[PDB]
Design a protein around this ligand. Structure first.
Ligand SMILES: CC(C)CN(C(=O)Nc1ccc(F)c(Cl)c1)[C@H](C)c1c[nH]c(=O)c2ccccc12
Ligand SMILES: CC(C)CN(C(=O)Nc1ccc(F)c(Cl)c1)[C@H](C)c1c[nH]c(=O)c2ccccc12
Lengths: 135, 138
């Protein structure tokens, strides 16, 4: 195979994004709604806009396909077609939660802010509750 | 919902790429291999390179996710009848989608966006002429 990192050209890495815990990311539904509310305009645009836009467009579309597949599985066993769709939110979901979050956040607050923040938050959430400064 | 066209910002549309028949596109395997042979250096890079490079990166990765899911489903299905109907679905539907998109991007990097689009119309016209009357080389 090849070894491409989605975050590489954006000055980050898969390792770095996994530094944030899995329960810090919004939902996929919420992230898609937010992208729409903040960016539908530019996302549906024919202008490139920015590399972030180009990526996010593909991320959204890709989540599209993944679901259409989990849909088409459950529309083709109540404990099996239900546990297939469960795997998606388990695994890929985290993947997209990260990736959507990264791109929306980078468009909304700046790439640099999103990286400063991500490290601070990982350090901070790993400090045990006992001694952790104010939320 | 949102209505995003992967090709829109690249001066094409889903409609237009559906103009070429489904058997004109190389396989996904062949398209990935070609992306690697020609572009692995740039694809692996930290530079943006071009919007195409950005887009192709995501396409490849996405295909990656789709397979890891189809795999996982097949190694969890049990019946050999039903592993046969899962892999059918992916070639039928998502494959064509990715065959188009991988192709569009690779070719655009290789021969230039305008060429790719001239050619695509020429071919769609030419292949739709019935065989009887159609010239030799598209
Ligand atoms: C209100 C948000 C700033 C909260 N938040 C977060 O990213 N949430 C969020 C970010 C992007 C989203 F699309 C959605 Cl749906 C949610 C995190 C926790 C955050 C907190 N504080 C920050 O200073 C910050 C800066 C950049 C990026 C994120 C943050
Ligand atoms: C050698 C290619 C120019 C052949 N080809 C094609 O698309 N093949 C191809 C294109 C992209 C690929 F990644 C792979 Cl693996 C194969 C088609 C038939 C083609 C033919 N003639 C053309 O003049 C042409 C121009 C632009 C794009 C494609 C073409």
């Amino acid at each position: 195979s090849m070894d491409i990192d989605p975050y590489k050209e954006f000055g980050a890495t898969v390792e770095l994004l996994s530094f944030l815990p899995s329960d810090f990311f919004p939902s996929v539904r919420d992230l898609l709604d937010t992208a729409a509310a903040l960016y539908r305009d530019a996302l549906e645009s024919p202008e490139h806009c920015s590399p972030h836009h180009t990526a996010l467009r593909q991320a959204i579309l890709c989540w599209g396909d993944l679901m259409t597949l989990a849909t088409w599985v459950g529309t083709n066993d109540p404990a099996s077609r239900d546990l297939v769709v469960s795997y998606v939110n388990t695994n890929v979901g985290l993947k997209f939660r990260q990736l959507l979050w990264f791109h929306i956040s980078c468009l909304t607050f700046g790439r640099e802010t999103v990286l400063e923040y991500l490290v601070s938050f990982g350090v901070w959430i790993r400090t045990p509750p006992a001694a952790r400064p104010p939320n």
